[PDB]
């Protein structure tokens, strides 16, 4: 099965290139899925000059698809509820007292079956699908106990069966802990984070072990025992860090080599220089940022300074960040966190890939990688970090078929 | 012709009634595209109990149509270039000579024909209509001369005439001044502004007269000739006023029963309770201050002590506010002024219909009004200002008739 995309602007993001890797006149040659050839239309080989189909892309820009390297995109129910309560004047305390607060996503979760989940997160993925998202990592988390950890899990593997994209899996038990556990934090990671990675990883539904470190749920040594445990069995890792406080989670997540660390609001300049070193993404969530008034900007030039690879993802979830679109997550990261355009087109493409450790796979415009990539109708790339709310998306190819 | 939506709940906005009007188990009865009947289905009287259709709406909400009171969606190109520049470290000179500033509008909107305006504002209003939006506000003021300022008004109208939606137009020709006249604001109103008036008048191209009262443009005395001229018309009039400073222009269009004073970043307490003594909605607009980065918050609190009527556009426009998206709008003027669900409920429905003067015919689900409504899969109204980037619409009714 071949096929040619020709007549188009490429912003192959290809690492070798400056800036974004943009080529002019260009071509895109596919085979069985695969990109065979990606470039100036001038320089296609011979054997690449005929296809079974050719698509007239009419000079209209493509990129990688996007991807989305942190969501939660698994839930019950929603919080609406607290929102409202919160924005009338309710205390901390009469939102708990009203059932708010992460307990309410993990009953609803806990009370929905797989089916159920299933058909709750569809029109999340489909949003992000239409927006020419191709990648999407899915953490669990909302279950807090062996069981429902799991079917999280389960649910995110179903979803990748019904729509034409690449799912990946976070093995995320050790992001609070449950009522029956108050207090008893090394309990909690003995009786279910530990066994419920094992038997996650078992089912080969874990692609990787998430965590969250921070004052307000697991600490430094806490998280420590979670990595080795994950590292003992071949499982990459990552971390929800510094987001509310400087803890030192980015340099556990470095020294563990792990794929990225995320939020990192509070993040300092020794962090920032560990995670550069150890090849360690610092993925930034401006959704939870904004939605949660926060004041304390991530280190963006420190990042920059330390060499470090910036994404951005949505971090779309019940109660700190229901966001579904990565458009305006670009948009968010240039006007929020001051981010370049090109930056932000690395951050959900390139970047977002090497996040999830599948750069050698997708996440540019390369011969030998997925093809995998949006037709967008714009003039410049620009365009998809500059408007808010809108959606330029001419068509989706994934794995070299165009799904719509 | 005739026709009833049933099981459904209904967010009536009815101001008689308490918070929103929320109706549980409730009906709607439409006859001649109007509403005859909104409420309780076992208050539904007999002689409505029929009607040629009948629709199930399975138990989701119903909320009036939404209403977008202030845009400038009618513009050639657009200002991707330099908002990359900005954030590239590019200064204004340099912005400048690249052809940046809002010159770049003016100029793509005075070279483009009717025909192309209209052609590229599709697209956008397309984006509003798919939430639900069926009654839009456009402004003219980039053209900066007669027959360019006449041409976006006449694009306006045409729009009308390709989808169902209700467009209400308002002459700002008095937005900035053009290259040949900077230094000349006096002769600018004198020879483009009030001749200008009078011709869309004479066409009966404009619904009402705006205007820019801030330092970078028209101050309160030039404002006021425009006014003037405008109510000699019979033309109502509304005013950009204290988005970047504290001029009194809030004041002025009290004084001038404006129908709405607009952006309000710097009013002071007396401007707050001029607007709600004189009857002026105050409409806020979240994306530019997003976009601009602007500091200087809105008196929300001020204007609800007053009593003054608060409403929510997305001021959509290429150099500030590129903003598509009224559901994002009202999830920003929750999260960035922290107005209740409530107010931004409100602020695009009831409000938004009387910033246009349109309350006594749209804008609410009370009898004798147009059958405007949205149907949407939500399962409480919160959720439409709760969530970042999603588009929960399952159905929009406009002048009685489903058309999405
Ligand atoms: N809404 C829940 N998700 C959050 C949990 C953070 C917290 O417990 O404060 C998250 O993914 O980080
Ligand atoms: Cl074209
Ligand atoms: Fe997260
Ligand atoms: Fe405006
Ligand atoms: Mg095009």
Redesign the interface.
């Known amino acids: 099965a071949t096929a040619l995309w020709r007549n188009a602007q490429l912003a192959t993001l290809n690492p070798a290139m400056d800036g974004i890797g943009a080529v002019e006149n260009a071509v895109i040659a596919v085979r069985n899925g695969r990109i065979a050839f990606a470039g100036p239309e001038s320089d296609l080989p011979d054997d690449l000059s005929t296809a079974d189909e050719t698509t007239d892309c009419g000079g209209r820009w493509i990129t990688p698809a996007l991807i989305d390297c942190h969501t939660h995109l698994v839930f019950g129910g929603?919080?609406?509820?607290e929102?409202?309560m919160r924005?009338?004047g309710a205390t901390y305390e009469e939102i708990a007292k009203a059932g708010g607060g992460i307990v309410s996503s993990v009953r609803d979760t806990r009370a929905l079956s797989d089916e159920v989940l299933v058909a709750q997160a569809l029109?999340?993925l489909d949003?992000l699908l239409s927006e020419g998202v191709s990648t999407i990592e899915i953490k669990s988390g909302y279950g807090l106990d062996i069981e429902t950890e799991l079917k999280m899990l389960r649910v995110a593997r179903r979803l990748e069966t019904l729509r034409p994209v690449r799912i990946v899996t976070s093995y995320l038990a050790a992001h609070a802990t449950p009522a029956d556990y108050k207090g008893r934090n090394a309990d909690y990671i003995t009786d279910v984070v530990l066994p419920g990675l094992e038997k996650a990883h078992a089912e080969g539904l874990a692609d990787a072990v998430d965590g969250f470190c921070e004052g307000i749920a697991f600490s430094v040594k806490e998280i420590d025992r979670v990595f080795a445990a994950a590292q003992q069995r071949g499982l990459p890792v990552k971390l929800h860090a510094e987001q509310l406080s400087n803890l030192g989670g980015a340099e556990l997540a470095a020294s563990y080599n792990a794929l990225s660390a995320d939020h990192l609001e509070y993040l300092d300049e020794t962090g920032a220089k560990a995670l550069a070193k150890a090849g360690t993404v610092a993925v930034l969530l401006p959704?939870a940022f904004?939605?949660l008034?926060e004041k304390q900007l991530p280190p963006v030039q420190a990042l920059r300074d330390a060499g470090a690879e910036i994404a951005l993802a949505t971090d779309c979830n019940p109660g700190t960040?229901?966001?579904?679109?990565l458009l305006?997550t670009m948009n968010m990261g240039?006007?929020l966190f001051?981010?370049?355009?090109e930056e932000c087109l690395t951050a959900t493409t390139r970047n977002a890939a090497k996040a999830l450790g599948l750069l050698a796979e997708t996440g540019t415009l390369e011969a030998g990688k997925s093809a995998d990539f949006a037709i967008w109708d714009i003039?410049?790339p620009?365009?998809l970090?500059?408007?808010?709310?809108?959606?330029?998306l001419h068509a989706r190819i994934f794995k070299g078929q165009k799904v719509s």
């Open positions: 929603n919080r609406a509820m929102f409202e924005l009338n029109p999340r949003t959704g904004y939605a008034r960040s229901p966001l579904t679109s305006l240039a006007t001051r981010m370049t355009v003039e410049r620009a365009e970090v500059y408007r808010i709310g809108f959606n330029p």
